[PDB]
Amino acid sequence: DRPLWSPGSEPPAWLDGSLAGDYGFDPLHLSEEPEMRKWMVQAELVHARWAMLGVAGILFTSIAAKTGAPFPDWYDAGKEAIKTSPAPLGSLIFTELLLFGWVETKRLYDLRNPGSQGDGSFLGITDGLKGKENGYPGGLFDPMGMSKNEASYKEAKVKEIKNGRLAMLAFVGFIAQHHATHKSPIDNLLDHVADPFHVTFATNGVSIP
Amino acid sequence: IPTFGFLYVAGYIGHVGRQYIILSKEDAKPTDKEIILDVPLALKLAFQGWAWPLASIQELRNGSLLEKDENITVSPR
C-alpha cells in the first residue's frame, strides 16, 4: 500500500507507515522498542535538520566564493576564520556547548515527558515550548507555519524528512569528493557540467586505483 | 592523598555493588539478575554513587548496612 525502499519487499512490523518518510527500510531491526523508536525519530529529525543547515551554509559560502566574494572553502573554513574572529577558540566552543546543552536537555526532558516544559518553569510560558508531536515542538517554533492544518503539516513533515535524508547524502558526498578532489563542491559541480563525459568520480586518480 | 583517592573509588565500587545486590534481591528469581544485568538501573546506580560515604554512614547507624546473625548462616562447629 506504500512505496517501499525495495519493490516487493516485506515491510517491518514496527514500521506501519505512520511516521514521516516511512519507506520501511530497516534491516538491522533498530527502533523496534517504542521508546527507542521515539529516540530514533528524534535523532533522525535533529541530524536531518543539522545536515540541511550545514549543507545550505556550505553551498551559500561556496557560491559566494565562486562569484568573486572573499569566502573560504567548506573545509578549513574555521581554521582561517579563527585568526580573524574576535572570539578565540576555547571560549567559543565552550559557550556554544553550554547554550546547546541548555537547549538540548530542555528538549531531552521534553522528549522524556511530553509537555514537561510547558508548565511555565522557563520564564512563564505555557503554550510555547511544549512538544506537539514526537520530534516536533510548538509555540515558539511555529511562528507563521501551517502546522495547524493536518494535511499540510503531514506534507511538510514528509518534505522535511526527505530533504533531510537528501542533505545527509549531500554531506557525505561533500566530504567524499572533497577528499577526492580537494576543491569546493560548486567547483566539482561546474567541472561535472563542463566535461561530463570525462570528469567524474573515476578519473580523479584517488578512489579508483 | 592517594590513600583517600583510592578509598573514594574503592568505596564507590562497594556501594554500587551493595545497592545492586539489595535491589536485585527484592525481585523474583534474583539469581538470573547476576548473569542477566540490567543497564538502566546499574547505570543509574553508577551515577548515584558519588556520595558513597554519606550513604554508608547513615546505613551503619540504623542497621540497614549490617545484619544480626539470627538470619545469617553460621558454622555448626
Binding site: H29, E32 | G5, E34, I36, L37
Partner: protein, 41 residues
C-alpha cells in the same frame, strides 16, 4: 532490537564495556599526561 539487546545486557558484554571504558580511560590519562609519582597538584 529487544531480543538482541537482552543478549547485549549479559555479563560477557558487561565484561567488555567496563573493561573497554576503564582501560581506555587509563590509556588517555597516561597518554595526554606524562608518568607522575606525586599528587602535588
Amino acid at each position: 532490537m529487544k531480543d538482541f539487546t537482552t543478549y547485549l545486557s549479559t555479563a560477557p558484554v558487561v565484561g567488555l564495556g567496563w573493561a573497554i571504558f576503564t582501560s581506555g580511560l587509563l590509556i588517555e590519562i597516561n597518554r595526554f599526561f606524562p608518568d607522575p609519582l606525586v599528587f602535588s597538584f
